Ligand binder design. Structure first.
Ligand SMILES: Nc1ncnc2c1ncn2[C@@H]1O[C@H](COP(=O)(O)OP(=O)(O)O)[C@@H](O)[C@H]1O
Lengths: 37, 450, 561, 450, 145, 152, 145
């Protein structure tokens, strides 16, 4: 059961990894289009 | 009147006229080309210059090259004889037959005819698919999208509806308009063969746009299709079903030119105008004046990257009366059709069901199956959390009901289920649940139908 | 100033050119220094040119000349064993002008011909080259060479009293070669690899995407296919080369052998390199040059395989050209135009009835290399939407030493039903049922392993342990194939089904024994199992004998009870 | 000829010339500065103006400031006497010795010599490290990256290979080119001392680029190193081993300027050109014409943020013939070298092993160890799930084998293992497994070698 | 507010409506103003702004939107009309984010002004729980009032 | 806001030789909220020792930006020139930020994360820097800023 | 480096300090440079960069930061001063992530440069174990040195 929270925890952080950082290469690209224009 | 190119950047060409400027939307013809090259006026830049968008490649254009104004936009050669023919995105023959002999020549943007009535969609369209007809009924005048993703058989469903759809005893004749956008040569050959072999072609107009056809021709494809549908419905009094695959591919082309047009991009790189262009297509549906005919749409919306929140599929939802959402996860479990029973909705479902339409218990059965399937799906999560043996007896029944719903109700061995057949399967699977747990079926229906 | 021009300015990678009044949009232009460029922008007072190389070799005032071509290719004897680049030229001419070829007349004076008709044969390289009337040319053969030896430039025939025909012909790589019709996917492209041929079939003239992260074995699937697939000719566009992947193929492949004949594989191959020092233009055109050469060989009545290393790098080269042309960037800064183009490429794939009857085909296998595991744009996303087949090399399957490392849960073929009848009629009546049964096995294993990940394996019933036992044998004895073994490097169709029936027969017997209370531990150590494990290494049907060896052994387990 | 600055924005300076424009890539010199300030021409803007990139800070520049054109870019003072010297990223002495006396002066971009043959990498390079020589053999002409992360001893491995590498009985002489990029003063002093003390310096050319050296000098460092390697290999017929640490640091500098150059950024903020610049470095390896010499690369690729999917390390994989991937998790378990046995591959391994190269059983042993170690590592997960006592006897053996592989095969007490020594350890640990469980070793090898 | 109508008209539609709404409350009536929706009104306004070359910000929306949208909702309220008597305009505005993102335009700026939010929940709907209002994510500022 | 109003009514500096005052500033509030705050200060007699600044939602955005500066200047004056212990209550800083953010776009700046002004932290610093003991050590300026979580 | 001070001054503060530090080591003194902290210096620099419209990256920080921060720490070291004699500048830099995340700016880039890290552990502190330095998470790449 603390197996659940365990490896499955790795789960939430590859998940979370994936995008507050991915979602950001992006708010900033679009800036970048007419941010650059 | 004639003009001269003053600038060329990819699909965007500027053209200066010394006399008479062509109005926005006019089709201009480039002189000196082996194949016809159309330029559609998009803007008046000032100084007698207009900005245009090419309908084919601009390689080989030179500054100073001559251009004539045709005096009108692009158009549909409208006739009842459109039925039985296969055409390109622009309405040119693909079936080795002669060009259409027009009864009328109609503009294609939606301005022609002013066909729609201010009346609500109503009455049945029998698709011949149980998961649509029984649980998410398509109604005449409705826009009911197929919501899917890459790899899923959305086009097989679209083709099957095209073969099977009818308007059961209607005094009005029925027709199909099938438009495909950005498809491969293999897919085009397949669609053609299917319409010809089945004899579905007799009551259909088919428009096929290939992946390598000009991007502008793809943009015009849905407009040719909707104009033909409105003509048949309004001037011939027909119930017309329009099937458009894939709206996402249409969007990829429209998006492709927005950059060449000088716009600042919006979210996800899309055109800032995404929703007001898409509105020009979803606005074109409903009962037509006279109430003899109607235009119904079944647009296919594939999720790019399977993301139903992508701006394209997300903005399409508002244009529909019924939505059928397909899911890769479900397809990978071998459940076909791969319809997500908790994300498919009928906006106008209540207008096409009940006594005198389907059967009096239809809403109650639909509500109970939806509720039980949703609970059963959540319990699949709970089983994973606690283990199968730790589930209560009551929850185990709901868990099992979800499998029964998928195995017996969703799955059809290709097979035309009447609404009576579909309600019968529904009641049969419902028996798996405790009668005391049928919260959404009034006792009157349990006694009469259980 | 119609055919030539003079550089106005250069810097920031675009050359602005005065003149070139007759240049076409997207035409190759030539600078005096010898560099090439592409006409991108046609304006009222200049042409903007993308330079396919270093722009310091270009100065204001430099002369620029038209080539007249989006591009072209030479198509005749001398193509085989040849190594070219993005725009066909020895790794400069294209086809040897000195080499003599034995031309054999296959038409007499007075015959009426049409584009695609075969007038002669040349044993340039066994292969037998088929000389055809260029597309768009018909009439009556008024003059034709006798059986002798001639160079390419020589005229072998005249039609309609004067069009002159040679052994070669030119064609715009950008324009797909004409054909009467494209046929429906019917015949499988026999790979010899069990997982592919069985579960994720490729049809002759099918488009099947190869996608996955860097170092998952994408290229290797392609190379094994070429060494052993049932295509007569291979067109390898070894793009995305770097560090030394160029020299890695430069003097290496010239030694790789044709398992079928024991001669160099290059003897039936055409290489199209796409190195980093090459302009984005050339790499962009490389798939079009290759596909045209591919379509050319299928026109002869050959089944050719087009292997595209990769389209991710081609879309990056195209994005570089587009951004330099100031086209509006979209998602990941890619131009809007890419999806329609990429689709148009894959559409040129297919098995056809060539001009003048006869059947040929071009099967495409494209590599997918996302920026990094993201598996979005460019490559993957757009590709997986076109292609009918996807073989997912799985890094986790590879680390686990399961070869081929193809994920039987994430891979798919839309051609399974399209090719099933070829297998049923020519190989085995139970091909489709067998692969469906194995896939259901693998599907069940996947579900079981997910649960075991939660509640552990101790609660597992004997029935579930048996399914994992057989599922494991499928993965190790079938899915996994050794590309380095002299035998298992290629698995003939006949061998693929025979191994499948040994595994499926062991499954039925396993489930049957359990149902009769035979300990799974007794089945797990069954002597035949070790033989089933080495079956992929046997080059003789001694493999189907294992079925009877399996049955009797289970009987010896029905005996002991 | 002289020009005048017309604009300055950070590293980008525009310069107008009244007579003679300097060609792209020419080095220009800013007048009126205390320290030499180079401007490299990048573009011709039109109107006699060029756009340039500064090699040092632009603070204190004024519009109108004078600039001269040097008439050329920058290059390598090539000579066999490069061996035994320590230089900067630009090839200037760091060892207090005189500047190189060139035999030839070579451009450094890769255009000079055209040295490579169209032949496959082959024959053994003895690194003296068992985990490379035995299981992932380095071959002459190959590109075999060390794949690591921050905190791991990748540089210790790189330095050890530099000290130990040889080409066992070859008729050709052997040389090392060691290039370090963006290193600290402490690291530079350490590398210098190591080469000098061991006498490794006698057969090596060393290029050291410091963190505070100009970013442009860092970009040029790998090009100076590869040009020296190609010269020694092609003109002197040597087998040359090039060690480049760290490619990720090279990338951080190249990325740093992409912004100043006006490009729209790509994923993760990187330059859009990441893969076609990196290709200019990984393309430069293989057998050279004549087949007397060769250029081999061992690039170090540290994972930024330990992410092997970051675009830099991810694009580097294709440039290699052998990859050694180091893992922080493994290092934290005290297993050194911290090589991930299920993520290290020989792209070209099969070309450097077997009878007449290593030994006939090498592939079988490598396959069996890899399979057993991967199973053993998964079983560490299963132990955590079920408990040690619930593991089967067979699984317990595989669990134990993973520890044995790490303790005895991966771990070396610094020590030059011959391939024979490495295969012996491999067979010794394999004995822990049931003989009946050696699926990947043919019976012929078991009888002969077990 | 149809798609064939200029961005201008749809932009002015909420102002024409609110004025008519204020007119009826002046009589001493309690009127409800239902705005389908402001997401589409902000898209029509962004089209007009971009055509006027005003500097795009977040999601390319003009800077001016937040103050304007607030000014609209400020015209809501129960008043003591000219010449005594009480009337009121209650506003119910629809929120349609570009797609689930629930950021800009619509949602973000709106949820900051409005005092009440009734969150229809697609999961509550699929579960056949009607009204499909999420009793955990919805809020009002008036319970004690 | 109930907590903020309660502190405004109740706060004191228990036996201090110095007089005590409150500065209460509200930003972007409704007419109903403004009427409520007024009534509360007047009824309780809290108004006798307080200066109150009220900025409405429909007041100019620039007036909202100036509100906290009027409030802090009054506090510093009372504390330094009159030797008072002054408590400044600012609600809501998030609403102040929505207005400052609203103009950053009209000012031509490239936006920072979440659409905010790039200068978010150096404008906000001009407000949080203004607190502490004043010269003479007879008075002081204390701040209780309200920070509502946008979207929690 | 107070909050009322421009981002510019705080940015330059480490450079002014290091120069003064290098000045004293030139005399033949061993000086310690203690930098409270670089997280705040990178926030002041991000403010200046965003105002200059430089392209934001991870956490909206400019691309230029990693090379700069490294260049700073590179000026640390024990040297043989001009005219012989030995002196040194030892740097101890404080790390303050936005909040426990311990990513960017500060920590991430710093822990990659520095040779030593003394991890104060809040759990070690709560347990009253002083100094609260975690002997399991701290490291000195100088032990052998
Ligand atoms: N079928 C295979 N069998 C064994 N190893 C393989 C196989 N495919 C790939 N690999 C391993 O992966 C390495 C990289 O494979 P490759 O196909 O070149 O990568 P990519 O997907 O980048 O093209 C190979 O050199 C080999 O070590």
């Amino acid at each position: 059961i603390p197996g659940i929270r365990a490896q499955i925890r790795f789960i939430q952080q590859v998940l979370e990894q994936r995008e507050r950082e991915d979602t950001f290469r992006l708010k900033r690209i679009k800036g970048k289009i007419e941010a650059r224009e | 009147e004639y003009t001269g190119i003053t600038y060329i950047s990819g699909p965007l060409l500027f053209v200066e006229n010394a006399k008479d400027l062509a109005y926005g939307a006019i089709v201009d013809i480039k002189d000196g080309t082996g194949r016809v090259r159309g330029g559609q006026v998009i803007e008046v830049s000032e100084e007698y210059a207009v900005i245009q968008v090419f309908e084919e490649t601009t390689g080989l254009d030179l500054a100073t090259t001559s251009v004539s104004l045709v005096e009108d936009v692009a158009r549909l050669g409208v006739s009842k004889e459109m039925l039985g023919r296969r055409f390109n995105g622009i309405g040119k023959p693909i079936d080795g037959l002669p060009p259409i002999t027009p009864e009328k020549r109609l503009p294609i943007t939606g301005l022609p005819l002013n066909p729609v009535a201010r009346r609500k969609p109503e009455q049945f369209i029998q698709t011949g698919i149980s998961t649509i007809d029984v649980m998410n009924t398509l109604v005449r005048g409705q826009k009911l999208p197929i919501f899917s993703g890459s790899g899923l058989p959305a086009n097989e469903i679209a083709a099957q509806i095209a073969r099977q759809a009818t308007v059961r005893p209607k005094e009005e004749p029925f027709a199909v308009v099938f438009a495909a956008m950005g498809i491969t040569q293999r897919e085009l050959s397949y669609f053609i063969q299917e319409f010809e072999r089945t004899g579905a072609l007799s009551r259909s107009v088919l428009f096929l746009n290939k992946a390598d056809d000009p991007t502008i021709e793809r943009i015009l494809t849905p407009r040719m299709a909707l104009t033909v549908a409105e003509y048949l419905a309004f001037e011939h009094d027909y119930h017309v079903l329009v099937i458009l695959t894939d709206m996402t591919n249409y969007c990829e082309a429209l998006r492709e030119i927005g950059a060449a047009r000088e716009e600042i991009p919006g979210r996800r790189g899309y055109p800032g105008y995404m929703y007001t262009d898409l509105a020009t297509i979803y606005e074109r549906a409903g009962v037509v004046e006279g109430k003899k005919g109607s235009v119904t749409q079944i647009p296919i919306l594939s999720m790019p990257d399977d993301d139903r929140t992508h701006p394209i599929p997300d903005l399409t939802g508002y244009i529909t009366e019924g939505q059928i959402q397909l899911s890769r996860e479900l397809h990978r479990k071998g459940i076909y059709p791969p319809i997500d029973p908790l994300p498919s909705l009928s906006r106008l479902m209540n207008n096409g069901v009940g006594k005198g339409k389907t059967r009096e218990d239809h809403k109650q059965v639909s509500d109970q199956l939806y509720s039980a399937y949703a609970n059963g799906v959540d319990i699949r999560k709970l089983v994973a959390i606690i283990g199968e043996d730790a589930l209560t007896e009551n929850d185990r029944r709901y868990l099992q009901f979800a499998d029964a719903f998928e195995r017996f109700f969703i799955n059809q061995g290709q097979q035309n289920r009447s609404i009576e057949e579909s309600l019968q399967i529904a009641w049969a699977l419902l028996s798996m649940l405790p009668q005391g747990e049928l919260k959404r079926i009034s006792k009157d229906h349990i006694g009469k139908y259980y | 100033m119609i055919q030539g021009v003079i550089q106005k300015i250069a810097g920031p990678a675009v050359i602005a050119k005065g003149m070139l009044g007759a240049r076409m949009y997207d035409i190759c232009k030539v600078g005096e220094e010898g560099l090439v460029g592409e006409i991108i922008r046609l304006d009222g007072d200049t042409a903007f040119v993308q330079v396919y190389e270093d722009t310091s070799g270009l100065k204001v005032g430099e002369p620029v000349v038209s080539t007249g071509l989006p591009l072209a290719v030479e198509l005749g004897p001398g193509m085989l064993n040849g190594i070219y680049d993005g725009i066909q030229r020895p790794l400069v001419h294209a086809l040897d002008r000195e080499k003599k070829w034995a031309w054999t007349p296959m038409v007499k004076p007075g015959d009426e011909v049409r584009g695609g008709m075969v007038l002669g044969t040349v044993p340039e390289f066994g292969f037998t080259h088929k000389i055809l009337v260029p597309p768009d040319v018909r009439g009556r053969v008024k003059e034709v060479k006798p059986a002798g030896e001639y160079t390419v430039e020589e005229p072998v025939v005249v039609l309609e009293d004067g069009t002159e025909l040679k052994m070669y012909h030119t064609w715009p790589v950008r324009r797909a070669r004409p054909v009467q019709r494209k046929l429906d996917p019917n015949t499988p492209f026999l790979t010899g690899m069990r997982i592919l041929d069985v579960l994720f079939p490729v049809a002759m003239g099918g488009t099947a995407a190869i996608p996955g992260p860097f170092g998952s074995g994408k290229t290797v699937t392609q190379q094994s296919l070429a060494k052993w697939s049932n295509a007569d000719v291979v067109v390898y566009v070894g793009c995305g080369e770097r560090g030394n992947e160029m020299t890695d193929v430069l003097v290496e492949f010239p030694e790789l052998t044709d398992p079928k004949t024991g001669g160099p594989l290059m003897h039936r191959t055409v290489l199209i390199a796409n190195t980093s020092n090459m302009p984005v233009a050339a790499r962009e055109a490389s798939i079009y040059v290759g596909v045209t050469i591919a379509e050319y060989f299928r026109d002869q009545g050959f089944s050719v395989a087009l292997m595209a290393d990769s389209t991710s790098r081609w879309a990056e080269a195209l994005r570089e050209i587009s951004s330099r042309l100031e086209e509006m960037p979209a998602e990941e800064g890619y131009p809007p135009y890419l999806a329609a183009r990429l689709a148009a490429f894959y559409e040129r794939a297919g098995k056809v009835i060539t001009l003048g009857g006869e059947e040929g085909a071009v099967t495409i296998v494209g590599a997918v290399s996302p920026p990094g595991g993201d598996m979005s744009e460019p490559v993957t996303q757009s590709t997986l939407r076109i292609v009918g087949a996807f073989w997912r090399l799985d890094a986790s399957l590879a680390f686990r030493r399961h070869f081929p490392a193809i994920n039987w849960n994430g891979s798919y073929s839309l051609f399974t039903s399209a090719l099933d009848p070829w297998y049923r009629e020519n190989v085995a009546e139970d091909y489709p049922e067998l692969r469906d049964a194995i896939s259901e096995l693998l599907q069940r294993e996947a579900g079981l392993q997910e649960i075991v990940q939660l509640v552990g394996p101790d609660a597992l019933q004997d029935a579930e342990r048996l399914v994992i036992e057989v599922g494991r044998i499928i993965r190790e004895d079938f899915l996994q194939q050794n590309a380095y073994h002299e035998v298992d490097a290629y698995c003939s169709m006949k061998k693929a089904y025979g191994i499948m029936k040994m595994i499926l027969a062991f499954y039925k017997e396993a489930e049957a024994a359990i149902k009769r209370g035979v300990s799974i531990d007794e089945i797990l150590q069954l002597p035949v199992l070790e033989r089933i494990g080495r079956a992929r290494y046997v080059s003789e049907e001694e493999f189907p004998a294992y079925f009877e060896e399996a049955m009797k052994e289970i009987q010896g387990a029905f005996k002991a009870l």
